[PDB]
Every structure is written in C-alpha cells, then in structure tokens.
Design a protein around this ligand. Structure first.
Ligand code: CLA
Ligand code: CLA
Ligand code: CLA
Ligand code: CLA
Ligand SMILES: CC(C)=CCC/C(C)=C/CC/C(C)=C/CC/C(C)=C/CC/C(C)=C\CC/C(C)=C/CC/C(C)=C/CC/C(C)=C\CC/C(C)=C\CC1=CC(=O)C(C)=C(C)C1=O
Ligand SMILES: CCCCCCCCCCCCCCCCCC(=O)OC[C@H](CO[C@@H]1O[C@H](CO)[C@H](O)[C@H](O)[C@H]1O)OC(=O)CCCCCCCCCCCCCCCCC
Ligand SMILES: CCCCCCCCCCCCCCCC(=O)OC[C@H](CO[C@@H]1O[C@H](CS(=O)(=O)O)[C@@H](O)[C@H](O)[C@H]1O)OC(=O)CCCCCCCCCCCCCCC
Ligand SMILES: CCCCCCCCCCCCCCCC(=O)OC[C@H](CO[C@@H]1O[C@H](CS(=O)(=O)O)[C@@H](O)[C@H](O)[C@H]1O)OC(=O)CCCCCCCCCCCCCCC
Ligand SMILES: CCCCCCCCCCCCCCCC(=O)OC[C@H](COP(=O)(O)OC[C@@H](O)CO)OC(=O)CCCCCCCCCCCCCCC
Ligand SMILES: CCCCCCCCCCCCO[C@@H]1O[C@H](CO)[C@@H](O[C@H]2O[C@H](CO)[C@@H](O)[C@H](O)[C@H]2O)[C@H](O)[C@H]1O
Ligand SMILES: CCCCCCCCCCCCO[C@@H]1O[C@H](CO)[C@@H](O[C@H]2O[C@H](CO)[C@@H](O)[C@H](O)[C@H]2O)[C@H](O)[C@H]1O
Ligand SMILES: CCCCCCCCCCCCCCCC(=O)O
Ligand code: OEX
Ligand SMILES: [Ca+2]
Ligand SMILES: [Cl-]
Ligand SMILES: [Cl-]
Lengths: 33, 30, 137, 333, 243, 51, 97, 35, 51, 33
C-alpha cells in the first residue's frame, strides 16, 4: 500500500508530544507533597 | 527532509548552549 | 643469494666480449652513480624524461647500443639522443661538458667504467625494480 | 567621560562573559566566522578547490549530510592570494572560488589568538597566575598549522584543512601520502601526548574518585559530598598516593598535588606543541622518516619491512589523490 | 610599452590591444604577397546562454549569465596564414596559439554552464572582391570545439574514457542499463561559427580591430547531459604582417 | 499557454481533498505544454462539444 | 549504442602495433632508430592513408627511409580517433613511469 | 564591492583602534591587588 | 506552466504581493532576468525575519 | 537524496524518547520541596 511516509512520523508525534506532556505534569504532581 | 533534521538538531544544540550559559544553576558559594 | 662473479659479469662491447667487475668496483660504481646521476636517474628511471630509462632492453635498442660497458662509457663521454642523430652534451652531463656540469670534472675512466658496471649490474639484481618506477617500489 | 565608562565596562569582571580588549577584537571576528560558517555549511554552492574547474559540493543543500559536509578550501588558482569579497566581481564568483573559506579561517585565527589573549586578561583581572593561555597555545598552534602554516609552505590555501569531517579525513590521508607523518617523530610525540593525556586524565580522575571521603549515604550521589567553596579537601591525597605507590612502586607516585597537576598540564601540552610543529615543519616539506629499500640482502635484493608496506599504502593514496590535477611526474607541491 | 610589473594583478593582461580612435584607414592586399596573422586576440565581453523551454516550440532566446571564472577568458597569441583566394576573398587559417579557454558562466538560479571558448582550427573567409581591408570587411568562419574534458579525465567515481573504471564499482550488483549514460564516457567534437566584424584599421602598422560574435555548444560532461548553446560577444585585435 | 492553463479544472481550488497533501504538481504532474484545443466531430462532420 | 571508443580501438590493430595516426609518440621508443627524430616527423605529418605513405614524408633522407622500411611491418593505419589525438595526447598522454 | 570594502575597512579600523587605545588606557593598573 | 501556486508556495505570494520579486540567485517570479533585487530579495526578507 | 525513510522517525525517536525522559525527571525534581 502506497501510504504517506510522513504519516508515520506524524502519527508518532501526534501520540508522543502531547502524551509525554501529560506525563510530565502528572509526574511532577506526584512529587509535590 | 534530512537537511531539516540536521539544522533542527544543530539549532536545538545552540538553544541548549544559551540555556546552559544564561539559565544555569547558580554556583552558590557555601 | 650473494654478489657472485656471475652477477658481476657484464658485456664489455657489442661484439660479445664480457668483463667481470670486482665488488669494490661495483660499490664504487654505486657510490658514483648516487653522486652524479641518481638525482635524475634514481631507480633506473629518468625524472626529466620518463619515456626513456636505464633498463638493459632500452639501452640495447638505443643507437648505438648502450647495453655494454663501452657503449655506456662512450655515452658518458658524448651523449646523444636515442636514435643517435643529435648530440645532447649541452643538456646532459658528460666529460665534454664538464665545465657546465661540474660533478663530471674529476671522473676518471675507471669511474666511468664503474658507473657503467653499476648500471648494467643493477637490473640483474633488482629485476623489474630497475627502471620500473613507483609501481615496483 | 564616555571613554572612561567604556573602559570600565570592557574590563569589568562583573559581566557574565568577560569582554576585555582581546574580547573587543574576539567577539566580532568569531561572530563573523561562526555566522559565515553556518551559512556556508548549509547553503554554499560547490567550490572549485583544485582550480581545475571541478567543483566540490560541501553544503547540506547540495547533497551532503553532517559527516560529508564541509566548507571547501579556496581555489588552487587563488593560491596564497588574499581573496576578500570585494576582490570578486560578484558573489557568485566569490562563492565559486572558495572565498567563504578564507573569510572563515582568517576571522577564526584572529579570534582564537584573541581568545588566548582574553584568557590571559581575565586571569590578570582575577589575581590568577597567568599560564592557562600557555596551555591553550597548543591547540591554537595546531589550528594555525593546519589552516595557515601548511597553506603558506605549500603555496595555496587549497591545501589547508577543509572545514568538515570528511574533508578533515581527506586532509589526513593526503598528508600521510605526501609527507609520511606517521613516521615523523613530532607526530609520534603528539600521539604520545594525546594518548598520555587520555591515560593521565582517566588515571587522575579514577584516583581522586577512588579516594573520596565518605560524606553521603548509599542512596545519594557521592558528588553531594562536596560543597562549592568548601575549604577542606574532598578526597584523601595520602590514600590515593598509597594506592598508586603500591600499584607500581613508591617513587613512581606523586605525593605532591602541585607537581601532579603540573605534569597533567605539561604532558599533553608539550606533546601537542610538538605535533603542531610537525605539521608546520612538514609544511616546509621536511617529511617523516624514509626507510624504503633500507634493508638489503647480501646480493642486493630489497628485503621489505613494514615501512615498505606503509610505502605501498602511501603510493596508493599518492596516485589517487586529486586525480585530474597533475600534469607532470613529480608532485612537487 | 608597459612591462610585466606594470601589468600584473591589474587585469590588463586579459584585455586585447585597442586601436586608436583616429584610425579608419585601409590596409592594401596584393594578390601575390602572402600574409600572416602574427597576433590574433579575442577578448570576450558577454556570454549568452540559450534557454531550454519546456514546450517543443517557443521563443528560445539567449539569456545573460555571470562569469565566475574571473579574467581567464581571452584568446591571444593566435597566428595563422592569411591567403588571398582567386575570388578576392581573404581566408584566415589558424595554426597555433592560445586558442581555447575553459569558461564557466552562471545562469539565474545558480546553474553553472562550463564551456570551452575556442577558435581551434578556425577557417574564416571574407566576401569576394576585398583588395583592401576596410571597416566593412567581415570574416565569417567555422572552428572545431573539442570536448571540454579530454580522454584522461576521471569523474568523481573514477570512471573515464581513456582511463578509469567502466562501471559503478560502489554498486556492484546494481542494474547497468540505467547507468549506461554515466558509465560510458563519450568524446564530442562539435562545430562553431564566428563572425569577426572589422571596425578600426591601421594601414601603416597593419593592425585591425573590431567586434566578434561566435556560437558554439557548452560542455556535455563527456556525454552525460545535453549541452547548451552559447553565444559569445566581444572585441578582437589582429596584427597582419606581410609574410 | 498561460490563458489555456487557467481554463483547466486541475487549477480549480475546489477540487482537492482534506488529506491530499502537498503541491498541486503532486496531483496531476508538472505541466509541460499545452496540447492544443481538442475539437470533436462525428462521421457527418458536425462539431461536438464535451460537457 | 554507447561505446567506449578507446576500448574499441584496442580491439583493432591499434592494440597490437603502432598506429601512425593515433599512437602516442613514446611508443616509437620500442623500435630502433625511431625516437625522437623520425617519430616527431611521423606524428607531425599524420594522418596517413596507408602505412607506406610514411615513406613520403617531406625531407626524409635515404637512411631514415631505410629505417622506416625496416619497421614497416610494425605499423598500422586506422581512422583518427578524436579522443586519442586531441589535447596534444600524441605528444603527452599523461602517462609516465 | 567598493562600498563594502570601505565599510569593512572602517569597522576593522574602529575595532583595532579600540584595542590599541584600550591597552594604552592604563591597563597594568586594572588588576585587583596593586594599583 | 509551473507558477508558485502550483508548487504549494504559501508565503512566497505574500512577499510577491507587496513588491518582493527577485532572488539573490538571479531569477524573478515575474519570469524576467537582469533585475537587481538589492538586499530585499526573498532571501533578504527571510534573513531579516530570522534576525 | 535517496535516503532511508525510517531514518527520519528513528532520529526523531532518538531525540524524543531520552530527552523527554530527562525532562520528566527534571520537572518532578523541581516540584519537590
Ligand atoms: C574585530 C573586528 C574585525 C576584524 C579585526 C576583522 C578582520 C578582517 N576582516 Mg572583517 N568584519 C568584521 C569585523 C572584523 N573583521 C565585521 C563586524 C564584519 C561585518 C560587517 C566583517 C565583515 C568582513 C567581510 C565581508 C570581509 C572581512 C575581511 C576581513 C579580513 C581583512 C580585512 C581587511 O582587509 O582590512 C584591512 C584594514 C586594515 C588593515 C585596517 C588598518 C588599520 C590599522 C592601523 C591596522 C594596521 C595593521 C598592522 C598589522 C597593525 C595591526 C594592529 C596591531 C596593534 C597588532 C580581516 C581578517 C575580508 C576577508 O575575510 O577576506 C578574506 C572580507 O571579505 N570582514
Ligand atoms: C590511533 C591513531 C592516531 C592518533 C592517536 C593520532 C593523534 C593525533 N593526530 Mg593523527 N594521524 C593518524 C593516526 C593517529 N593520529 C593517521 C593514521 C594519519 C594518516 C591518515 C594521521 C594524520 C594526521 C594529520 C595530517 C594530522 C594529525 C594530527 C593529530 C593530532 C590531533 C590532535 C590535535 O592537534 O589537537 C590540537 C587541537 C586542535 C587541532 C583543535 C584546535 C581547536 C581550536 C584552537 C579552537 C576550536 C574551537 C571550535 C571551532 C569551537 C568549539 C565548539 C563550541 C565549544 C563552541 C593528534 C596528536 C594533527 C596534528 O598534528 O595537529 C596539528 C594533523 O594535522 N594526524
Ligand atoms: C599492545 C599495545 C600497545 C602498546 C604497548 C603500544 C605502545 C606504543 N605505541 Mg601504540 N597503538 C596501539 C597499541 C599499543 N601501542 C594500538 C592498538 C593502536 C591503534 C591501532 C596504536 C597506535 C599508535 C600510534 C598511532 C602511535 C603509537 C605509539 C606508541 C608508542 C608511544 C605511545 C605512548 O606514549 O602511549 C601513551 C602511554 C604512556 C605515556 C605511558 C608510558 C608507556 C611507555 C611507552 C611504556 C614504558 C614502560 C617501560 C619501557 C617498561 C619498563 C619500566 C620499568 C623499568 C620500571 C609506544 C611504543 C606512537 C609511536 O610510534 O611512537 C614511536 C605513535 O605515533 N601507537
Ligand atoms: C495558515 C496555515 C497554513 C496554510 C494554509 C499552509 C498551506 C500550505 N502548506 Mg504549510 N505550514 C504551516 C501553515 C500553513 N501552511 C505551518 C505553521 C508550518 C510549520 C509546521 C507549515 C509547514 C509546511 C511544510 C513543511 C509544507 C507545507 C506545505 C503547504 C502547502 C500544502 C498544504 C498541505 O499539504 O496541507 C495538508 C493539510 C492537512 C492534512 C490538514 C491537517 C488537519 C489537522 C491535522 C486536523 C487536526 C484535527 C485535530 C487534532 C482535532 C482535535 C479534536 C480535539 C479538540 C477534541 C500549502 C500551500 C507543503 C508544500 O507543498 O510546500 C511546498 C510542505 O511541504 N507547509
Ligand atoms: C613464577 C613467578 C615469577 C611468580 C611471580 C611471583 C613473584 C614473587 C614475583 C615477584 C618478583 C618479580 C616482580 C618478578 C620480576 C618480573 C617483572 C620485573 C615483571 C615485569 C613487569 C612488567 C612487564 C612491567 C611493569 C612495569 C611497568 C608497567 C612500568 C610502567 C611505569 C609507568 C609508565 C609509570 C608512570 C606513572 C606515572 C608517573 C604517571 C601517573 C600520573 C598520574 C596521572 C597519576 C598519579 C596520581 C594521580 C592522582 O590523581 C593522585 C591523587 C595521586 C596521588 C597520584 O599519584
Ligand atoms: C512541537 C513538537 C512537535 C509537534 C507535533 C508535530 C505534528 C504532529 C501531528 C501532525 C498532523 C498533521 C499531519 C498532516 C499530514 C501530512 O503528513 O502532511 C504533510 C504536509 C506536507 O506535504 C507534503 O509535501 C511534500 C513536498 O511538498 C510532498 O508533496 C508530500 O507528498 C506532502 O505530503 O504537511 C503540511 O502541509 C504541513 C502544513 C499543514 C497546514 C495546512 C493548513 C491548515 C491548518 C489548520 C487546520 C486547523 C484544524 C483545527 C482542528 C480543531
Ligand atoms: C547575521 C547578521 C546579523 C547578526 C545579529 C547579531 C547582532 C548582535 C546583537 C546583540 C544584542 C545583545 C545580545 C547579547 C546580550 C547578552 O549576552 O547578555 C549577557 C550580558 C548582557 O550585558 C551585560 O548585562 C547588563 C545589561 S542588562 O541590564 O542585563 O540588560 C549590563 O549591566 C552589563 O554591563 C552588560 O555587560 O552580556 C555580557 O555578559 C558582556 C557582553 C558579552 C556578549 C558577547 C557575545 C558572545 C560572542 C561569542 C562569539 C562566538 C559565538 C559562537 C557561537 C557558539
Ligand atoms: C643535556 C640535555 C638536557 C637535559 C634534558 C632536559 C631536562 C630538563 C627538565 C627539567 C624538569 C623540571 C620540571 O619539569 O619542573 C619541576 C617540577 C617540580 O618537581 C617537584 O620539585 C619540588 C621541589 S622544587 O620545585 O624543585 O623546588 C618537590 O616538592 C616535588 O616533590 C617535585 O615533584 O616537576 C614536576 O612538577 C613533576 C616532575 C615531572 C614533570 C615534568 C614535565 C616536563 C614536560 C613533560 C615532558 C612531556 C614530553 C612528552 C609528551 C608526549
Ligand atoms: C546504568 C548504566 C547504563 C550504561 C549504559 C551504557 C554503557 C556504555 C559502555 C560502557 C562505558 C563505561 C563507562 C562508564 C564509567 C563508569 O565507571 O560509570 C560508573 C557510573 C556510576 O558510578 P558512581 O556510582 O560512582 O556514580 C558516579 C557519580 O558520582 C557521578 O559523578 O555510572 C554512571 O553513572 C553511568 C551511567 C550511564 C552513562 C551513559 C548513558 C548512555 C546513554 C546513551 C543514549 C541512550 C539513548 C536511548 C535511545 C532509546
Ligand atoms: C527530528 C525531526 C525534525 C522535523 C523533520 C520533519 C519536517 C518536515 C519534512 C518535510 C519534507 C518534505 O516532504 C517529504 O520530502 C521528501 C524528500 O525530502 C519526499 O520524498 C520523495 O523524494 C525523494 C527524493 O528527495 C525520493 O527519493 C522519495 O522516493 C520520495 O518519496 C516525501 O515524499 C515528502 O513527504
Ligand atoms: C594605529 C594605532 C597606533 C597609533 C596611535 C598611538 C601612538 C602612541 C601615542 C600614545 C597615546 C596614549 O594616550 C593614552 O590615551 C588615553 C586616552 O586619552 C589616556 O587616558 C586614559 O587614562 C586613564 C588610565 O591612565 C583612564 O582611566 C582614562 O579613562 C583614559 O583617558 C592615557 O593616559 C594615555 O596614555
Ligand atoms: C540568509 C540565508 C541565505 C540562504 C542562501 C541564499 C541563496 C543563495 C544565493 C547565492 C548568491 O547568488 O549569492
Ligand atoms: O592540492 Mn591539495 O595535495 Ca599538496 O601535493 Mn600537489 O598540491 Mn595537490 O597534489 Mn599532492
Ligand atoms: Ca564593420
Ligand atoms: Cl583527494
Ligand atoms: Cl602538475
């Protein structure tokens, strides 16, 4: 199947950039007490 | 595509240089 | 392998007569070759004219033949081109141009014989290295 | 007085980065060299380095990656001629003939010399002993050897080291072909300098780390056992000396920290001084040792050594380098 | 009478000699005396490259370019036989001289056009009934343009014509049909046309000067790509001696 | 040729897609030449017009 | 279609003997009495329709004509390859020892 | 090019004069210990 | 037949709209030659924005 | 240039996964007191 190659990195970035953002916030919430 | 990647990594290194020089942990003399 | 008298046996004239050099004569010929010729004839090649060289086959096809002691001594006294049509003493060292080539001034007949003997013995020792250039280094 | 205020600001030790008068020269030259290097490394058109109308592409946009990219040295037709932008009829001509290389290397060499002067200047303003600039003179001498002295001796800035990774490797290989630098004693002293510098760096680091005084618990990093500006020594010099003196023998070990740190400064600096001098002396074609056909048997046959194998490799490099640039049998420069 | 030290570094060595403004005479030509060009100089001032339109039929006009190889462009010291034909036309056949210069010109968009600006083996004749060379004499002629690189040139992958590899050695198992245009170097000899228009004559010293326009092809990279048509415009100077 | 190139629905901006990315040349190719106006006729010879 | 003309020339008699129209002048060293004078005359007066037209070089002497007659069997004539004779490669083809 | 040459000459002359006259402006005094 | 709007150029038409036509490499989006853009070519505008 | 396609995403992941990891450990360090 002749798919857009950039789609893969796009999908990865679409997963990774916001998810780790949430992870960052969550982890720094857990170390606050 | 590969040129953009090289220039992006180089620019990130230069930005890191800026933050490591001007926004470092201050050496607090005890 | 040793420097036997069979190694040091070289043609004297074009007729077929041969001479046998002593090891002292061969070493003096090597020293005088390094003194007066090697700056342009190192390894049997010619730096300023690489199409000619000091290989025995090349000297044999020269006019007159230079693959014997007498021909080489005559060349050292009166050098010519490869076909023997013009004398080149004004640009090649010789006894007759020792005033413009000062390193040829004190060369005796024995020195010329020793240099010629070194030229004739070196291919027999070195194989294709003599006159071969950098391929055979 | 405006001049007095400017002099006070230039020499002020309260600036985050010290300027000084050497920095007054250093900042514009290094900024110019850096900006022109970045622009040339990304976007310069191909450069006819060998002067034979055979342009070599070194920028990223013309088909290079980080490894193969370079700022190509100026044309062999230029030689040692000064080639600023205003000497060219247009920017296209200046880019074709490798003008960016001359701009970058001249600004860089001036800025790095002023960097050495600036190191002295700040050491003087802080009440320090002044010889850090002397240690920095070794890489600076190396840069001068590969960018200026070797082009001067060879007669062209085309033979300077290219500003790139693969261009550097090309410089090394052609240099070994033409000068046999591996057999040069000054390069061997340089290898002893850098190998010994790495060895003594690892040695000093491991010996100090080995003798750190217990100030922390097992959970935390040992680096928190040192506080910045503390008066006591953070490690036991006597324990490290006892270890290293039992490792070899007592009199091969420094018990004096000042002598040890002087040795740490002196060994790689002197070694790199010698290898930079090796590059300069080979720029005037005083080459490394030539042992080709040195070993001869009783008859007269050549007995090869490892030097003859090195000579075969050098011959391969010599006959392949700059494959269209030579018209005559001897590569005289 | 300028010495070499008065000329070096200035750029005057690339300039053809000029004739004086008050010199529009006629140089007589005897039909029995043989003549020679003792010095023919050609100083180009403008390089025009024919653009390649996408469509098959368009204007296809010459566009200006930027010289990037500096003052290395003039042909000089050219000698030849200037013979008188039976029709009265004067034919110049060159023999030797600095009759070629490699020249790279940059088109708009950064593309570089290498060419061998040459008049090699030029044969150039006039119209019939020329008994005196005047400011109306024209020399129309043809010359050979050999390959920009000769047969010993090695490409960046070590391939060439008289020397080098005959294949792409860094792709040992790639298909060789697609790379046959780059693997097999070809030597090209094309033809060029030049018109030399006489504008100033010195009947005493035999010197003539004027303008030239020549058409040739550019470098083809030993047959890798198609050449571009180049028109070269400039000034010329020729010294005519009686042989 | 420019005027004929304007009269072509591949240059209509209302012919693309939301996830058809890239230039217009990525779609139908890079235009090289106008092939000329096509006139369709039947066997009688009457001119025919494509809708 | 795309052929290397030098290899094709090696396929002809150029690869076996001295071609009077194409061969570099240094090859005339490999026969007695040709280099440099007769070789210079031969290379100067090329092209040749056949081998025996080398005897009709202007200014030849009787001795040089006899020398050429003794080396007539070592010569061939082929069509002038442009790549072999352009750039002055018949006098200096870039090959030394 | 001529304007660029004059501009670069002016800039270089300015910075070099700054360097020279700055090191003439009592530099050995500007040290923390003596004078 | 291959203008800027066929090539996915998004910011090139705005620079061209307000008067930036030339490039430092010699071409012009108007298709003519000879024109000297000065500093304010497309590259000059991009460089000014980066600075 | 005819480069490897996955060389984009690999490079991105080579930057992204470790860097954000360090960023996570940095930010939760700063929120501790
Ligand atoms: C610290 C400032 C500084 C210095 C020292 C230099 C130095 C240089 N630039 Mg430069 N440059 C600078 C800032 C500087 N640049 C800035 C800010 C820009 C951006 C506008 C540029 C843009 C630029 C371009 C575009 C080019 C240069 C070039 C050059 C070189 C030759 C310039 C020349 O011919 O001047 C000659 C002028 C003088 C010598 C001035 C004479 C005045 C005094 C009396 C000096 C006397 C000389 C004598 C040895 C004494 C020296 C001082 C002594 C105390 C040690 C040289 C390496 C050119 C280059 O690299 O060519 C390859 C070139 O093309 N520069
Ligand atoms: C295991 C094998 C080995 C080893 C250990 C070495 C070791 C060395 N070789 Mg060597 N070499 C080898 C094999 C080896 N070689 C072989 C096989 C060949 C033949 C192909 C060569 C050919 C060769 C050549 C031709 C040269 C060397 C050189 C050197 C020296 C380089 C280090 C140096 O000069 O630093 C000193 C420091 C520098 C060079 C850097 C200068 C830094 C400047 C001053 C500042 C830079 C600032 C920068 C731009 C910005 C920083 C970024 C950021 C902070 C902002 C070193 C002694 C070089 C030499 O002798 O140096 C002169 C040299 O020219 N070698
Ligand atoms: C088997 C491992 C081995 C050993 C023993 C050596 C040894 C040496 N190499 Mg070598 N080398 C090696 C592997 C090795 N190399 C490898 C794998 C490479 C890469 C392929 C190289 C590449 C390389 C280059 C490129 C060069 C050397 C050079 C040298 C010499 C000086 C290096 C130096 O100061 O090092 C740093 C180490 C020290 C400063 C510590 C001191 C070490 C000394 C030599 C030992 C003294 C011990 C003493 C004699 C024993 C008795 C002592 C007792 C009486 C108390 C030295 C003879 C240089 C050379 O040829 O010099 C002539 C040189 O140019 N080496
Ligand atoms: C105003 C914004 C804008 C516009 C109109 C354009 C227009 C254009 N760009 Mg461009 N670009 C922009 C901003 C813009 N750009 C920015 C900010 C960047 C930097 C990242 C780029 C980087 C860029 C590159 C690198 C390239 C272009 C290209 C192009 C051209 C092709 C368009 C294309 O393929 O789109 C594709 C558009 C889509 C597939 C639509 C995306 C829809 C998103 C993903 C929907 C998101 C839904 C959301 C997640 C839902 C959340 C729900 C939640 C709230 C609950 C076109 C002229 C290309 C070209 O041809 O240039 C030569 C090209 O190569 N652009
Ligand atoms: C069957 C048998 C025989 C059985 C064996 C059993 C037996 C009883 C045998 C014993 C008898 C015997 C020894 C046998 C003889 C055999 C023998 C002679 C072996 C040969 C050994 C051999 C091959 C070589 C060993 C010698 C050798 C390795 C010498 C190298 C010397 C060397 C270069 C040392 C210099 C080191 C030095 C000066 C530099 C280090 C500088 C530095 C960075 C560190 C110093 C330092 C750093 C710190 O940062 C701190 C802080 C401290 C303080 C400090 O100092
Ligand atoms: C910061 C850190 C990193 C951030 C995350 C990076 C992005 C991750 C998510 C990517 C999503 C986009 C993927 C698009 C598909 C793709 O690959 O396109 C790829 C295209 C590039 O187009 C490519 O071009 C190439 C050369 O031109 C070739 O032709 C390719 O075939 C072609 O795909 O990308 C773009 O065009 C990017 C710009 C898009 C702008 C369009 C305008 C509309 C934007 C507004 C929409 C608002 C929506 C609101 C929703 C509520
Ligand atoms: C491509 C062409 C276009 C190129 C564009 C270039 C334009 C340059 C514009 C510069 C504008 C100012 C920005 C710098 C501010 C700053 O640095 O803050 C830090 C302080 C701020 O001023 C200090 O701080 C105070 C000022 S303030 O109150 O903080 O505002 C003040 O009290 C103090 O006296 C003063 O010293 O600056 C200093 O510490 C002293 C000056 C040192 C700056 C030198 C620049 C670095 C040169 C390195 C060369 C090699 C680099 C290679 C890359 C690795
Ligand atoms: C005839 C030919 C000429 C002879 C050959 C030249 C020899 C001259 C050398 C003089 C040595 C004096 C000296 O160095 O400073 C003297 C100091 C003081 O020693 C320290 O001396 C101290 C007392 S005092 O300083 O002497 O007063 C003492 O406290 C301490 O224990 C002691 O370590 O020595 C040291 O600090 C450590 C000794 C070894 C360090 C020497 C480094 C020299 C350069 C390294 C060479 C590298 C080259 C290879 C690189 C690849
Ligand atoms: C947990 C260790 C992991 C090491 C993995 C790499 C090993 C490299 C080969 C051996 C080198 C030997 C040198 C060690 C030297 C040595 O002795 O180390 C020992 C040291 C621990 O020693 P101490 O307990 O004394 O701690 C020292 C502290 O006081 C610091 O001063 O280990 C480390 O902290 C190293 C951590 C790894 C450092 C490298 C990280 C690798 C990252 C690479 C990029 C990853 C990208 C992923 C993409 C998906
Ligand atoms: C660390 C990540 C930093 C950000 C990196 C990503 C930024 C955006 C990159 C856009 C690149 C342009 O868009 C992408 O270009 C490449 C060429 O470069 C195209 O690739 C195409 O061209 C190449 C030649 O170059 C062909 O060999 C290949 O077969 C073909 O697919 C893609 O089809 C297109 O999608
Ligand atoms: C190309 C340049 C070379 C040619 C020009 C130089 C030739 C040599 C002439 C000597 C001139 C030196 O003149 C020098 O000037 C400065 C600036 O006014 C003087 O004045 C300076 O004094 C003190 C330091 O003592 C500073 O705090 C003060 O702000 C400053 O004005 C110096 O005391 C004087 O010594
Ligand atoms: C600022 C970034 C500049 C990028 C390169 C500009 C394009 C090349 C033009 C070359 C020239 O003709 O000067
Ligand atoms: O340029 Mn760079 O390297 Ca010094 O040698 Mn000659 O020149 Mn080229 O050859 Mn080898
Ligand atoms: Ca006229
Ligand atoms: Cl090379
Ligand atoms: Cl040469």
């Amino acid at each position: 199947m002749e798919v857009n190659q950039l789609g893969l990195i796009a999908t990865a970035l679409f997963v990774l950039v916001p998810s780790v953002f949430l992870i960052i916030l969550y982890v720094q919430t857990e170390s606050q007490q | 595509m590969e040129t953009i990647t090289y220039v992006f990594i180089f620019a990130c290194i230069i930005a890191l240089f800026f933050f490591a020089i001007f926004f470092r942990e201050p050496p607090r003399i005890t | 392998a040793e420097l036997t008298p069979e190694v040091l046996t070289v043609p004297l004239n074009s007729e077929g007569k041969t001479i046998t050099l002593t090891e002292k004569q061969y070493l003096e010929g090597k020293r005088l070759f390094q003194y007066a010729c090697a700056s342009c004839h190192v390894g049997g090649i010619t730096k300023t004219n690489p199409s000619l060289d000091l290989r025995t086959e090349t000297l044999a096809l020269a006019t007159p033949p230079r693959d014997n002691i007498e021909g080489l001594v005559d060349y050292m006294k009166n050098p010519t081109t490869y076909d023997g049509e013009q004398e080149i003493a004004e640009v090649h060292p010789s006894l007759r141009s020792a005033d413009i080539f000062p390193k040829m001034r004190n060369l005796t007949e024995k020195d010329l014989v020793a240099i010629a003997g070194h030229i004739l013995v070196e291919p027999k020792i070195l194989g294709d290295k003599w006159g071969g250039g950098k391929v055979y280094y | 007085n405006l001049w007095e205020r400017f002099c006070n600001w230039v020499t002020s030790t309260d600036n985050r980065l010290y300027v000084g008068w050497f920095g007054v020269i250093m900042i514009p030259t290094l900024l110019a060299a850096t900006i022109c290097f970045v622009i040339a490394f990304i976007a310069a058109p191909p450069v006819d380095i060998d002067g034979i109308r055979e342009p070599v592409s070194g920028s990223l946009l013309y088909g290079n990656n980080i490894i193969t990219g370079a700022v190509v040295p100026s044309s062999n037709a230029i030689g040692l001629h000064f080639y600023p932008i205003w000497e060219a009829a247009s920017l296209d001509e200046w880019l074709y003939n490798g003008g960016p290389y001359q701009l970058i290397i001249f600004h860089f060499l001036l800025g790095a010399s002023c960097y050495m002067g600036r190191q002295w200047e700040l050491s003087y303003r802080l009440g320090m002993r002044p010889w850090i600039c002397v240690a920095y003179s070794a890489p600076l001498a190396s840069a001068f050897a590969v960018f200026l002295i070797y082009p001067i001796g060879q007669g062209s800035f085309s033979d300077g080291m290219p500003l790139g990774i693969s261009g550097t490797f090309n410089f090394m290989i052609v240099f070994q072909a033409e000068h046999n630098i591996l057999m040069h004693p000054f390069h061997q002293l340089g290898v002893a300098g850098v190998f010994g510098g790495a060895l003594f760096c690892a040695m000093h680091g491991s010996l100090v780390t080995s003798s750190l005084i217990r100030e922390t618990t097992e959970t935390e990093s040992a680096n928190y056992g040192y506080k910045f500006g503390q008066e006591e020594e953070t490690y036991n010099i006597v324990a490290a000396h006892g270890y290293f003196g039992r490792l070899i023998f007592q009199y091969a070990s420094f018990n004096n920290s000042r002598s040890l740190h002087f040795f740490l400064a002196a060994w790689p600096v002197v070694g790199v001084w010698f290898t930079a001098l090796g590059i300069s002396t080979m720029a005037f074609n005083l080459n490394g040792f030539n042992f080709n056909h040195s070993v001869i048997d009783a008859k007269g046959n050549v007995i090869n050594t490892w030097a003859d194998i090195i000579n075969r490799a050098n011959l391969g490099m010599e006959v392949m380098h700059e494959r269209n640039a030579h018209n005559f049998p001897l590569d005289l420069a | 009478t300028l010495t070499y030290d008065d000329i070096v570094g200035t750029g005057l060595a690339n300039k053809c000699p000029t004739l004086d403004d008050t010199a529009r005479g006629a140089y007589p030509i005897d039909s029995s005396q043989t003549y020679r060009i003792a010095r023919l100089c050609l100083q180009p001032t403008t390089f025009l490259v024919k653009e390649e339109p996408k469509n098959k039929r368009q204007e296809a006009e010459f566009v200006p370019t930027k010289l990037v190889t500096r003052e290395t462009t003039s042909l000089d010291q050219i000698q030849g036989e200037l013979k008188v034909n039976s029709d009265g036309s004067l034919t110049f056949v060159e023999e030797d001289g600095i009759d070629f210069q490699p020249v790279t010109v940059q088109m708009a968009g950064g593309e570089r056009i290498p060419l061998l600006f040459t008049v090699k083996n030029l044969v150039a004749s006039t119209q019939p009934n020329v008994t005196s060379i005047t400011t109306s004499t024209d020399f129309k002629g043809e010359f050979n343009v050999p390959s920009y690189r000769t047969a010993n040139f090695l490409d960046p992958k070590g391939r060439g014509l008289a020397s080098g590899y005959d294949s792409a050695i860094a792709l040992p198992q790639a298909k060789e049909e697609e790379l046959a245009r780059a693997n097999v170097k070809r030597f090209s000899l094309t033809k060029g046309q030049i018109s030399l228009n006489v504008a100033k004559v010195d009947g005493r010293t035999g010197e003539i000067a004027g303008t030239f326009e020549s058409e040739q092809l550019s470098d083809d990279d030993m047959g890798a790509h198609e050449p571009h048509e180049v028109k070269i415009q400039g000034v010329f100077y020729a010294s005519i001696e009686p042989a | 040729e420019k005027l004929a190139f304007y009269d072509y629905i591949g240059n209509n901006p209302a012919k693309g897609g939301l996830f058809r990315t890239g230039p217009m040349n990525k779609g139908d190719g890079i235009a090289q030449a106008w092939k000329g106006h096509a006139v369709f006729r039947n066997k009688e010879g009457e001119e025919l017009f494509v809708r | 279609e795309l052929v290397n003309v030098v290899d094709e020339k090696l396929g002809t008699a150029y690869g076996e003997k001295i071609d009077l129209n194409n061969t570099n002048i240094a090859a005339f060293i490999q026969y007695r009495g040709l280099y440099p004078t007769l070789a210079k005359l031969i290379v100067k007066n090329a092209p040749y329709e056949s081998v025996e037209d080398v005897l009709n070089i202007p200014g030849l002497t009787e001795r040089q004509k006899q020398i050429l007659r003794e080396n007539l069997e070592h010569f061939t004539v082929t069509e002038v390859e442009t790549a072999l004779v352009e750039g002055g490669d018949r006098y200096n083809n870039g090959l030394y020892k | 090019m001529e304007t660029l040459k004059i501009t670069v000459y002016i800039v270089v002359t300015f910075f070099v004069l700054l360097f020279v006259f700055g090191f003439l402006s009592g530099d050995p005094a500007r040290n923390p210990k003596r004078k | 037949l291959n203008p800027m709007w066929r090539q996915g150029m998004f910011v090139l038409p705005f620079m061209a709209r307000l008067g930036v036509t030339g490039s430092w490499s010699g071409w012009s989006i108007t298709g003519e030659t000879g024109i000297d853009p000065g500093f304010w070519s497309f590259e000059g505008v991009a460089l000014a924005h980066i600075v």
